[PDB]
C-alpha cells in the first residue's frame, strides 16, 4: 500500500482523500460503471442465470419393475 515517502506522502495522501468523499469514494467515473455492468453480466453466465440467493429443490418418483 505504501513505500517511498518522498513521493509517497503526497501520493498516498491523494488516495485517502478518495475514501474521505461520498460523491463516490472521491468520484467514480463512467468508464468503470460501463465495464462493471458488462462484467456483471458475464459471470452470471459463468455459473448460470439462476440466483444463488436461493437454493435448489427437487422432486420424486418411483416405478414398478415386475
Amino acid at each position: 500500500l505504501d513505500p517511498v515517502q518522498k513521493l509517497f506522502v503526497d501520493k498516498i495522501r491523494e488516495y485517502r482523500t478518495k475514501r474521505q468523499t461520498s460523491g463516490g469514494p472521491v468520484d467514480a467515473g463512467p468508464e468503470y460503471q460501463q465495464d462493471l455492468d458488462r462484467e456483471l453480466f458475464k459471470l452470471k453466465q459463468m455459473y448460470g442465470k439462476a440466483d444463488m440467493n436461493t437454493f435448489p429443490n427437487f422432486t420424486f418418483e418411483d416405478p414398478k419393475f415386475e
Binding site: P3, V4, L7, F8, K11
Partner: protein, 167 residues
C-alpha cells in the same frame, strides 16, 4: 610474436587492432599524445575529398594512395610511424574508418585519458583519476537542485516501480 603494451580496454578488434597496436607502439616511447594530435589534424585533412580522394575512388590504385595520402603523410610531418601505419590502413582499407580508429586510440572520455560513470545524468567524470566519488560531489555543486532534464530526470524513472506495486 612480441609481447606488447596492451594497456587494457582497448577495444581489441575493431579499428582498435590498430589502436591496440599503437597502444603498444606509441607507448613504446610514449609518443602518444603527440601522435593523438597528429591524428586529429589529419582527421580533417583526410576526410575532406582531398586526402580522402582515394576514398572517393579507390580505383586509383593503392600505390597511388600511399603516394597521395601522401608519399607517406609525408606532405605534412605526421609520421613517427604514423605515416607508415597510415600507409598501412590505407591499403588495409581501414582508411574510411579512421575517425573511429582515432577515437579508439585517442579519445578518452575514458581510455587512459579520463572517466564517465552514471546512474543519473551526464556524469562524464573525465579525469584519469583513481577516484571520482567526490569529483561528482564537486559537480553537484554547480547546481544541486536545478533542472535535471539536463540529463537524468530521475522523475519518471524512479517512479517506475511504485506503479508496479499497485500493479
Amino acid at each position: 610474436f612480441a609481447k606488447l603494451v596492451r594497456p587494457p580496454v582497448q577495444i581489441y578488434g575493431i579499428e582498435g587492432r590498430y589502436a591496440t597496436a599503437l597502444y603498444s607502439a606509441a607507448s613504446k616511447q610514449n609518443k602518444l599524445e603527440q601522435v593523438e594530435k597528429e591524428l586529429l589534424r589529419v582527421g580533417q585533412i583526410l576526410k575532406e575529398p582531398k586526402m580522402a580522394a582515394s576514398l572517393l575512388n579507390p580505383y586509383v590504385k593503392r600505390s597511388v594512395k600511399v603516394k597521395s595520402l601522401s608519399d607517406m603523410t609525408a606532405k605534412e610531418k605526421f609520421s613517427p610511424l604514423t605515416s607508415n601505419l597510415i600507409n598501412l590502413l590505407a591499403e588495409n582499407g581501414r582508411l574510411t574508418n579512421t575517425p573511429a580508429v582515432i577515437s579508439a586510440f585517442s579519445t578518452m572520455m575514458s581510455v587512459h585519458r579520463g572517466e564517465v560513470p552514471c546512474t543519473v545524468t551526464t556524469a562524464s567524470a573525465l579525469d584519469e583519476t583513481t577516484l571520482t566519488e567526490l569529483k561528482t560531489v564537486l559537480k553537484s555543486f554547480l547546481s544541486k537542485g536545478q533542472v535535471l532534464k539536463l540529463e537524468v530526470k530521475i522523475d519518471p524513472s524512479i517512479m517506475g516501480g511504485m506503479i508496479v506495486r499497485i500493479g
